[PDB]
Amino acid sequence: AKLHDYYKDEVVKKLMTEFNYNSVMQVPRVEKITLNMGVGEAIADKKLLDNAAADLAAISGQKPLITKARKSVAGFKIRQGYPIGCKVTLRGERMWEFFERLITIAVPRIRDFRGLSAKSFDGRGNYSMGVREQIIFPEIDYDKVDRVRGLDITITTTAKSDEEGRALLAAFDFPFR
Amino acid sequence: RNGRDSEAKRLGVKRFGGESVLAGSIIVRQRGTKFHAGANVGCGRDHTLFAKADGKVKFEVKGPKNRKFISIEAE
Amino acid sequence: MLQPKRTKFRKMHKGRNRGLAQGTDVSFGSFGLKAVGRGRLTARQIEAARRAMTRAVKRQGKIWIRVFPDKPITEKPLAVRMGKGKGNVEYWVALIQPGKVLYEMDGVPEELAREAFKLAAAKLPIKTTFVTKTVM
Amino acid sequence: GIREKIKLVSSAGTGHFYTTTKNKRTKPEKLELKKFDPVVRQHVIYKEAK
Amino acid sequence: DKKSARIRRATRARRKLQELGATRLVVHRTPRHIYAQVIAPNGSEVLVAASTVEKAIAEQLKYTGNKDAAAAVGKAVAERALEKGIKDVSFDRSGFQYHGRVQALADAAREAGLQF
Amino acid sequence: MKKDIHPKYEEITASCSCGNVMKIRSTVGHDLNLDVCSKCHPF
RNA sequence: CGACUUACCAACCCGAUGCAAACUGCGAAUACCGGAGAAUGUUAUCACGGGAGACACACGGCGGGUGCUAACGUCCGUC
RNA sequence: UCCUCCUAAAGAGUAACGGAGGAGCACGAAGGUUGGCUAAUCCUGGUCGGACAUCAGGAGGUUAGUGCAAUGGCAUAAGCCAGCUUGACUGCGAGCGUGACGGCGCGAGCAGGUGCGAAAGCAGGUCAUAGUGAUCCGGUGGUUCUGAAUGGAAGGGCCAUC
RNA sequence: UGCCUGGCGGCCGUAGCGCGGUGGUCCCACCUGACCCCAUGCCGAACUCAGAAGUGAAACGCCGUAGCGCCGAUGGUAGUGUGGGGUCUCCCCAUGCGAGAGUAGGGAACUGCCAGGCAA
C-alpha cells in the first residue's frame, strides 16, 4: 500500500509533466497481475496439483483456480476437462502489496542474477516475465519443497502503447537490463 | 453399396399467407426454424408452427437478422 | 495431365452443355483461341494442344490454360451388362460453350501466334478462331 | 440395448407403478424419485423394484 | 461493454413480455436516479413514469440511489398507477439482479397496491 | 472476499543485513532473515 | 549472448479468370395454395351407396438419372 | 426395416442392382426451471514449453459448439457453468398434418396434484428429423366387472406391464 | 418551440465500420470505499451495496470526412410460359414475363411516447 501512496503523491505529477497530457487521468494505471504455470505433468502424476496450488497460495494472498485445456491436442496427449495448470489474479490492494514483496526482496535473490529483460513487452501495455525457482519468495526455504517448478508473472496496465508503457515501468524503477 | 433412402416427411408450408385458419391448425412443417412464431402463433417441440387463435395467417420480416415470422390477425 | 486433386465426389451427373460461355474476353495476355463450337475437351486433348504450342513458339512467351477438366467421366468395361451401378472414372473432360477462350498467348509476334494456335486447333474436336486483346 | 428396464413401485399401499430404464453397473443405486400416484392422487416416493 | 451485456441479458424477458401482450413495469438502475416506467403492450406508449430526477420527488430524500429513494419512487409510481386505473403489470428486471434496489422497488410497489 | 478458504495474511516485519526494515503481509511465517533488498545491493 | 544476405522453396492474403446434382452473400418464368369479381360450362364439384375393370403399358415433345448426351435401350416427372 | 442429402424439373409427392452416408442407442442426468456467461482461427509478450498445453492484450464475429451420420436451425442462444429439483406427472384434449388402411406426428386449453422463480411465467422428457415389431398364445400386479344350482374359487374381462 | 440528455419502441446495413473533431450546468460513464446485504468454481473484475473528491481518456452521444461495407436504376444480356420452324446431343421466330452481375447514381439515417436540465 506504500507504493500506491507513493504512486498517488508525486509520480503522477512526474508522469503528467513528462507526457504533458491535457489531463492527469490519461496516465496509465496498473489494474491487475496474474500468476500462472502450465505444469502439464498432471497426467503423469495427478496428485501434484495439491502442492502446486498450495505453494502459489502461500506466494500469493489467496487461493488459485485450476484451469482446463481449451481443446484436444494429440501432440501433448491432453483433452479438455483434465487440469494442466493453475493461476491466480491479483487486483485492488492485494496486487499493490504483492508487487512490493516482488520488487523489494524477490529480484535481488535471483540465483545467478544477470538482468531483467526489457524487450519483453506485448505492445499494448502488458508486461510478462518468468522465474526458475521459488527461492526468490521468502515462503520457500528448501526444506518443505523439492521441485524446480517455475511460474510466470504477467502485469497488465491501462497503457495504450509501448512508449507510455515503458515510461511507466521506468517510473517504477524496474531493473531495465 | 448405395440404394438406401428414407421415406419423405412431407415438410413445408401447409397454410399460405392471407388464408383464414382455425385455432390449432398447422401452418408450417419444418426441421429447424425457417419461420419464427409471432402473435397468436406457437412453436411446438418439433418446431411446427400452429395457430393459437382464429384468423388469417400473415408473413413478414422482423428482427435485426431479417428473419421471417408468421402471425395471425384476428379479422 | 490436368486433373483435380482430392475432389469432393468421385462421380457426378452427366448434366447438359446448354448455355453460353462466360470467359469470352482476353484478360491475361494478348492473343486467345476462342471456341465457337459446342462440346467438351478431354485432358488428353488439352495436353496435346498445349504441347503443340509450347513447341511451336520454341520456349518463348507465356501460355495460359483457361479451361480445366474438373468433371469425371465414366466408361463401362467391355462385355458388361447394363446396370450394376455407375461405371468407374477413366478420364476427365471440360465443358466448353461457344465463345469460351481456351488458350491464351502473350509475348510473341502476332503472326507466330496464328500458326501456333492453328496447329493447336488442328488437334481439337470443336470450331475455334483467333482473337486479340480488345481495349475494353 | 445394454441399458435394461426397471419398475418403480409407489411407496404408498396402492400397487400403481411406473416403468423406465437405467444402467445397473453405472448407477447400481436405487431410484427414489417422487412421482404422481393416480390411485391416491398425491405425489409420493417411488422405490425401484424388479 | 456493460451496456451491451445488459440488453443481451434482458432480451429474453423483453421478448417474452412482448408476446404475452401485457403491461410491463420496466426499471432502469444507475449509480444515481433509479428510473421506473410502465409500458403498454404495444410498446410505443408509456402510461406512467417515476424517478428521483423530478424535484417534486427529490425534495425530501437525503440522497438519490438508496433504498429510501428506491422505496419513495416505488410508492410514487404505485399511486400514479392506481389513480390512472391500471392494476395488473409484469415486473421487468431489465438485466438487473432482483437483489437490492430492484427488489426494494418491487416489494414497495407490491405492498402499495401494484400486485404482480 | 471468500472466507475460510485462503491462507493467513497476517502482517509481519522483516529486516535485511544492510539495515533496511519493512513490514509486509504474507504467510512467510514468524521471522525473516534477509541479506539484500531492492536497494543496498550490488546492482 | 548481438546480427544479416539471398541467383532459392513457400504459408496466410490481395488483384484478375473459371467450374459444381450432393456450394449459395442473389434469383426468375411456370406450377401450387388462399381471397374477390364477370362471363361461360347439361353440377363440369363433394359426400354416401350398388357394380366394375385395371394394377405387363407403348411412342412423341419437354426436364433428368443410367448407357457411349448409342439403341424402336432402360428408369422417373409433365403433357 | 428405419434416418440425411442429391437425383426431384423453386408446394407436396416421385423410380432405377442411381451417387454419398448413418441407425437397432444413450442420458435420473446430458431432463425441468432459475441465474450467469459467449466460440474457431491468428498476431505480440512470457520458466521448462518446442508448430501445437496454460496466462495477458488485440484482430476476428460463429470459420466454434451442439451425446452419435447428414441436412436444417440455434445470440432471447437450442452452445457453456452453477443452484434447487423430478412436468420424463395422471385423466382428457377443440383443431390440424400425414398415410389405402393398421398407424404415426403436432397441439392451445380444462381438471387434479407438483417443481423452479420475488413475479409475470415455464415444465405432459432430450435443437429437430433414425434408436424399432402388428396379432395370437402366455407370465406378473391391481380391480366382487363376470364367475355357467347357490356361497366361494378356478378361468376369463378391464387397467398396468413383460 | 429550440438546443440537449436518459428510458422504452417502429424500422432495421441509405441504418453498419474506419479516420478526424467536439460534449460535463443536468444526465451518463469512469471513479472512491465496502465492517454489513450480495458475489468470485481465486480476484469489489463481473455482480451488489454505501458515496461523491475528481474527470470527460476509455465508453457513450453529436458533428464532419467517402476510405469501405451497403442501397441502386435505365438499357442490354441470360432464362422461361404459350404457339410455330430448323443445318434438331442445340438454337431460332411471334408473343408475354424478365433477372443475376456490372454501370451512372444514392448514401456516412428518419421517426413515435415519456422524464429531466438549459435557453425562450
CSV table of C-alpha atoms in Angstrom, one decimal, chain E residues 44-87:
chain,number,residue,atom,x,y,z
E,44,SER,CA,-45.0,2.7,-28.3
E,45,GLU,CA,-46.7,4.4,-25.4
E,46,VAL,CA,-45.8,4.9,-21.7
E,47,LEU,CA,-48.6,5.2,-19.1
E,48,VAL,CA,-46.7,6.5,-16.0
E,49,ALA,CA,-43.1,7.2,-15.2
E,50,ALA,CA,-41.3,7.9,-11.9
E,51,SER,CA,-37.8,8.7,-10.9
E,52,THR,CA,-35.7,10.8,-8.5
E,53,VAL,CA,-34.7,13.4,-11.1
E,54,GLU,CA,-38.0,15.2,-10.6
E,55,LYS,CA,-37.6,18.0,-8.0
E,56,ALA,CA,-41.2,17.1,-6.9
E,57,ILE,CA,-39.8,13.7,-5.6
E,58,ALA,CA,-36.3,14.6,-4.5
E,59,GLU,CA,-37.1,17.5,-2.1
E,60,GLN,CA,-37.3,15.0,0.9
E,61,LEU,CA,-34.7,12.3,0.0
E,62,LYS,CA,-31.3,12.9,1.6
E,63,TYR,CA,-29.6,11.0,-1.3
E,64,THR,CA,-30.6,9.5,-4.6
E,65,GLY,CA,-29.7,5.9,-5.4
E,66,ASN,CA,-30.5,4.4,-2.0
E,67,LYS,CA,-33.2,2.1,-0.5
E,68,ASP,CA,-35.2,5.1,0.7
E,69,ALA,CA,-35.0,6.7,-2.8
E,70,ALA,CA,-35.9,3.4,-4.3
E,71,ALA,CA,-38.9,2.9,-2.0
E,72,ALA,CA,-40.0,6.5,-2.4
E,73,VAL,CA,-40.1,6.3,-6.2
E,74,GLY,CA,-41.7,2.9,-5.9
E,75,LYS,CA,-44.5,4.4,-3.9
E,76,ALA,CA,-44.8,7.3,-6.4
E,77,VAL,CA,-45.2,5.1,-9.4
E,78,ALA,CA,-47.5,2.8,-7.4
E,79,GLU,CA,-50.0,5.6,-6.6
E,80,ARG,CA,-49.7,7.1,-10.1
E,81,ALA,CA,-50.7,3.7,-11.5
E,82,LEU,CA,-53.7,3.4,-9.1
E,83,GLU,CA,-55.1,6.8,-9.9
E,84,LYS,CA,-54.5,6.0,-13.6
E,85,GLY,CA,-56.6,2.9,-13.3
E,86,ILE,CA,-54.0,0.3,-14.3
E,87,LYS,CA,-53.8,-2.6,-11.9
